[PDB]
Amino acid sequence: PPTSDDIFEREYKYGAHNYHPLPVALERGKGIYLWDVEGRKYFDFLSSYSAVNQGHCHPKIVNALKSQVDKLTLTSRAFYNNVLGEYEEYITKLFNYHKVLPMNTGVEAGETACKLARKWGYTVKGIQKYKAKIVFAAGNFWGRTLSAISSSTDPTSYDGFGPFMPGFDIIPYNDLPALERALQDPNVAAFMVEPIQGEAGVVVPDPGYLMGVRELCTRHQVLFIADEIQTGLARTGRWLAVDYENVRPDIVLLGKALSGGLYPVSAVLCDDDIMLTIKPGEHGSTYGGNPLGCRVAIAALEVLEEENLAENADKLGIILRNELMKLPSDVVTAVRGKGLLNAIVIKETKDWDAWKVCLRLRDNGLLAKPTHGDIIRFAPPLVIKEDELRESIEIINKTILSF
Amino acid sequence: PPTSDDIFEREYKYGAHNYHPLPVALERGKGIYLWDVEGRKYFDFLSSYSAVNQGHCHPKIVNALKSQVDKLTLTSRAFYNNVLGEYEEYITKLFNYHKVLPMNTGVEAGETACKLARKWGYTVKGIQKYKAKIVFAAGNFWGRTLSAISSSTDPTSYDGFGPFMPGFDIIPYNDLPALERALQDPNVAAFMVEPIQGEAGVVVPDPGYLMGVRELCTRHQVLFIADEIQTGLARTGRWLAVDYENVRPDIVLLGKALSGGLYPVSAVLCDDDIMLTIKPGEHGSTYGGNPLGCRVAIAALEVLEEENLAENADKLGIILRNELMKLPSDVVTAVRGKGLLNAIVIKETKDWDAWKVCLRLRDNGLLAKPTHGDIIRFAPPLVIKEDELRESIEIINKTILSF
Ligand SMILES: *[C@H](NCCCCC(=O)O)c1c(COP(=O)(O)O)cnc(C)c1O
Ligand SMILES: *[C@H](NCCCCC(=O)O)c1c(COP(=O)(O)O)cnc(C)c1O
């Protein structure tokens, strides 16, 4: 039986070094808990970047996969499968959009959104071909494709990865005057923005920012693209993080928790006047819309609905942030977030940083990832209960004040 | 009980119109057979673009998925999981490369290969930053991302989709002189090519083109990237189509049959000097390398090995091409292919075409899809047997001569 150090050394020898994970080798997961190969038990306070909002191996999602895998898993889109239309009707009625375009990973949904915005910009808005612009916010993250890192302001994402995709403008985040200035270019076809910036360090914009984006985009006839791949599906306390200001984006991107972690499923939602600019043969994906991922996506959505995970994430997130703000200011310098998507800012020194705090948190039974050496994210599964949350808060307080 | 027509209209109402599939609504699949919602039984001669080489719902792959879904499905790569290193050692030793970078979809493996080539071009070869070029062959297909369509010579894939990715040069397929001409530029970092062009219509290059490409790339210090996402994993009669010419590419792209159609799993294989140009935090993906997909990948590869599907694809492919060449020259003008990846060219008129041939093949219990109005692909799962193949050949004969 391989030990933890045996697992690390194997991946180091046979796997690419594109990651430096926290040294812990998990083998089992259920609900909010993870178990390493030595049997130790941990609070999962990362949730695989909100991909297991429903908890690890939720039985209802597991049973949908097990039932469908015996029947049919992949026909490709050259033919019809019987499950896709069921999932399509369900999700478009749920979020109240005309249609959905199914993909697999989150960056594939973002690529589809950029392609929809350009095609709509040329064939509907009438922009001169191949001058269409898409505006992004600084600190944005929507994948690791060449196009995704082309709009990135993070040097680690784009440094050394070749000439970059043109047609992408970058403005500061949480800045309405900068968006107004950017939207003066009549070649702008879309503004793609996260309601909360996850990988940037759980950056929450000021109240009214989302209404301002919706108003500005409407006034200049520009597509409002909301990337809810991380913020959506009850993680911030609502079905969509844009529900906190009640704005209707033109294009909504879903993913991650869309399958509870059991299958790579993403989705792109918009109305007919945007969706139907793409004709047959002009876009798609091999596994996109396969019957297996559709069954787990139907079940993963039903778990969020019938277990009221959005409400639980809302009231539990207020407890988490309030308890975190009691830590001394000379240790944590900021606590922010919405619902169960939160982060703390560490007064980093030369000797003490967020990585060491996470190593000690692991020692005390709580797993979390640092995002920038002074930021630590706390995002547990939404099925957590108040007592389990308070137990984890005890682990956080003890670890933080033990330095 | 939704009927076949009901399934068509439901997807039309709530789903994007990016496809025009053959009108047949499948709900069950096993081995080489597919069943529609009315209970009719079909031969599958597309294999979901070689994604179910092992047949639909192979019990060994299904059992691997059913066993792992209850333990653990997704930790993200911020932590370690016990399954990934097992798959990494298995797939690297199997194909004889140092390391593997796991991704989900085929286009994501292509994007990863491009990022590896560029990072290798700047950090190892010494190209000034963002002058690196990647050469592609006309008629190529490797996904629908912005980067992917930026190298396509098919207008239906790049038309109306905005500014394109710089640094992508295109040369004619099956053209060694054009390749050396393109490689005279020292800023070229890689050449990505399919050993047999699938979506182009099963375009098999001349003998020696592969070892010539291998020789030209090595001479000019250029990375040879072989896209075996469709040609690899026994579909053409070998583990990799390049094995027919003993060619070892610098980077191999695998995908799609890598999971037997049960999960989106793709792989990027290369040695240390190429792979380790990407440092921790510089590339990744949420679902890339999750334990659930690694288990079904190990089982999918094991099925291909211990069932000798490459030898089976080699033998039966010879029979299939032999029988197909017995068709008259005024109806079928060309028959090409390696192993069980084959295609026929239809003497298309205004009267009849390949779509009507595939419609009537569907009527006679065999599913296949045309690729260009005059090309029809015949690619059944590699678990097919000779008598089952000959029954299908009879169906292919009687439909063609029925026009
Ligand atoms: C998901 N990214 C969250 C952090 C994961 C980093 C990593 O690469 O390991 C995310 C995406 C991309 O989704 P995929 O990783 O391609 O499935 C896009 N947009 C948002 C808001 C995300 O959180
Ligand atoms: C897979 N062939 C794509 C099948 C076309 C149907 C569709 O819906 O697009 C393939 C890829 C792309 O892999 P992914 O679709 O991204 O998983 C890349 N390269 C080759 C040679 C393929 O066969």
Numbering used by the authors:
A (entry chain B), B (entry chain A): 37 to 439
Text lifted from the article:
pmcHuman ornithine aminotransferase (hOAT) is an enzyme that catalyzes the transfer of the δ-amino group from l-ornithine (l-Orn) to α-ketoglutarate (α-KG). As a pyridoxal-5′-phosphate (PLP)–dependent transaminase, hOAT has a “Bi−Bi, Ping–Pong” kinetic mechanism. In the first half-reaction, PLP and l-Orn are converted to pyridoxamine phosphate (PMP) and l-glutamate-γ-semialdehyde (l-GSA). l-GSA is then prone to cyclize to Δ1-pyrroline-5-carboxylate (P5C). In the second half-reaction, hOAT catalyzes the transfer of the amino group of PMP to an α-keto acid, preferentially α-KG, forming glutamate and regenerating the PLP form of the cofactor.
The structure of hOAT crystal soaked with AVA revealed an intermediate that closely resembles the gem–diamine intermediate. Unlike other intermediates in a typical transamination reaction, the gem–diamine is an early intermediate in which the catalytic lysine, the PLP, and the substrate are covalently joined together, and the observed electron density can be fit convincingly to such an intermediate state. The carboxylate group of AVA formed a strong hydrogen bond (measured as 2.2 Å) with Tyr55 and indirectly interacted with Arg180 through hydrogen bonds via a water molecule, and the Glu235–Arg413 salt bridge remained intact. That this intermediate is observed in the crystal indicates that the lattice greatly modifies the magnitude and relative rates of the chemistry, in that no evidence for a gem–diamine species was observed for the same reaction in solution. Internal aldimine and gem–diamine were found anchored by the side chain of catalytic Lys292 tilting the pyridine ring of PLP. Thus, the observed AVA gem–diamine intermediate is likely resulted from a trapping effect during crystal soaking. To the best of our knowledge, this is the first experimentally observed gem–diamine structure among all hOAT substrates. Of all chemical species present in crystallization condition, only the phosphate group of PLP possesses the right geometry to fit into the observed electron density. The electron density observed in the Ser186–Met201–Phe204 site likely represents a PLP bound only as a crystallographic artifact.
